[PDB]
Amino acid sequence: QLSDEQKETILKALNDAIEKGPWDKSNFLRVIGKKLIAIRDRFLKRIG
Amino acid sequence: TDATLGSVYSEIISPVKDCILTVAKAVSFNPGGKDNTDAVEVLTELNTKVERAAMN
């Protein structure tokens, strides 16, 4: 269903968000950050 | 397995959408604080980009 350019575009978005978000500003946001990383790992598991 | 347009919406867009809603609750409770609002912005940015990537 997904093309290769779509997959990389989405992965790149996940990475950017994980890298720049305030995921280390509070414990609450830390969890949010962890969830985001969990979402990316799930996506990586499928396209790989 | 493998990612599809569906799994993008069910396994990425929806979860992120949920996170935004929850962070919104933290904002509504704790005014002072730039972090929670920055987080919503980043997540909104994420979803708009993912949705466009999936629709094209």
Q: How many domains does chain A have?
A: 1
Task: Report CB contact under 8 Å: B35, A26.
Answer: yes
d(CA B32, CA A7): 38
* Residue type present at position B23: V
Q: Resolution (in Å) of the shown entry?
A: 2.2
Task: Report CB contact under 8 Å: A28, B26.
Answer: yes
Closest residue by Cα to residue B22 from B36, B6, B34, B41: B36
Q: Which of B1, B35, B45 to mutate to test the interface with A (most CBs of A within 10 A)?
A: B35
Asked if A43 is an interface residue toward chain B (Cβ–Cβ < 8 A), one would say yes
* Residue type present at position A12: K
Which domain does A31 fall in, by range?
1-48
- Find the CATH number of the domain harbouring A7: 1.20.5.420
* Domains of chain B and any CATH numbers: 1-56 (1.20.58.90)
Closest residue by Cα to residue A48 from A7, A6, A18: A7
Q: How far is the alpha carbon of B6 from chain A, nearest alpha carbon, in Å?
A: 9
Place of tokens 């949010």: A32
